[PDB]
Design a protein around this ligand. Structure first.
Ligand SMILES: COc1ccc2c(c1)OC[C@H]1CN3C(=O)CCN3[C@@H]21
Length: 282
């Protein structure tokens, strides 16, 4: 079925939970043996969210190459994404090592450091120009260059220096600051505006390594972001845009990381975002 009328048909019939449970039943199951090794316990935030072995990002280290991060490679859309958890106190150096080694231009953050009165990820970037951060375990230096605070999101320019080689690179930090502590946003307008700002920066384009996107677990809000981006790109590429099937795209993405889209409300919100976004594109 088309999307917008499939949408109204699920609303009128109140069957979002049944649709979402079907997706959960059909989703791929692949091994995640490296994630479960005892030496990696303090590298995982949640015991039930792990990268598959076949698609995990490897650190360029011989001691321990493990990080909780997955490469989502979308062949028809010609887009790739790295989805990862919010960094932990003992993985902030690994996080920036990955950004460096994978040649990423941008980092997309969809959570606040504290939500619901609890810490959802480490404070992993500097807040003042004159107070830079040094990660001694991976030999990197990170400096805040500029910050632009808007009503729904903040964009930061950062400098990452590999202290071994003295090479430097500019990284863009796109921080969506207004996702509610509970539920999903009422309108997709600010989320879509944010997606378009990331696009306009070059961070999603083939001349760079894959964008790094995270929330707390790296599957819910993060899944909404890449699912909406890929569906909109396919609607531009194809002769028949009504052929784009958001449930099929989501199941394709779940071949590369488990659990993408965590609730039936997130599934409905993803439909809404693609529907509204397809009208603005034209
Ligand atoms: C309904 O709310 C929105 C918000 C943003 C946008 C929407 C609808 O339409 C599609 C794209 C096209 N676009 C740009 O190119 C810049 C921002 N907008 C995006």
């Amino acid at each position: 079925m088309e999307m917008e009328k499939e949408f109204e048909q699920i609303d009128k019939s109140g069957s979002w939970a049944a649709i979402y449970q079907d997706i959960r039943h059909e989703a791929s199951d692949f091994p995640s043996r490296v994630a479960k090794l005892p030496k990696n316990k303090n590298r995982n935030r949640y015991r039930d969210v792990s990268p598959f072995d076949h698609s995990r990002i490897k650190l360029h280290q011989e001691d321990n190459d493990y990080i909780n991060a997955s490469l989502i490679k979308m062949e028809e859309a010609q887009r790739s994404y790295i989805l990862t958890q919010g960094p932990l106190p003992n993985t902030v150096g690994h996080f920036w090592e990955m950004v460096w080694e994978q040649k990423s231009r941008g980092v997309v953050m969809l959570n606040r450091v504290m939500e619901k009165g609890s810490l959802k990820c480490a404070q992993y970037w500097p807040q003042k120009e004159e107070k830079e951060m040094i990660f001694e375990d991976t030999n990197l230096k990170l400096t805040l260059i500029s910050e632009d605070i808007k009503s729904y999101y903040t964009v930061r320019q950062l400098e990452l220096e590999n202290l071994t080689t003295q090479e430097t690179r500019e990284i863009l930090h796109f921080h969506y600051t207004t996702w509610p502590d509970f539920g999903v946003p009422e309108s997709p307008a600010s989320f879509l505006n944010f997606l378009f700002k990331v696009r306009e920066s070059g961070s999603l384009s083939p001349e760079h390594g894959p964008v790094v996107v995270h929330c707390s677990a790296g599957i819910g809000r993060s899944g909404t972001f890449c699912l909406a981006d890929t569906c909109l790109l396919l609607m531009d590429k194809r002769k028949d845009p009504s052929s784009v099937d958001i449930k099929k795209v989501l199941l394709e993405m779940r071949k590369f990381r488990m659990g993408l889209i965590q609730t039936a409300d997130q599934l409905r919100f993803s439909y809404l975002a693609v529907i509204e976004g397809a009208k603005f594109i034209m």
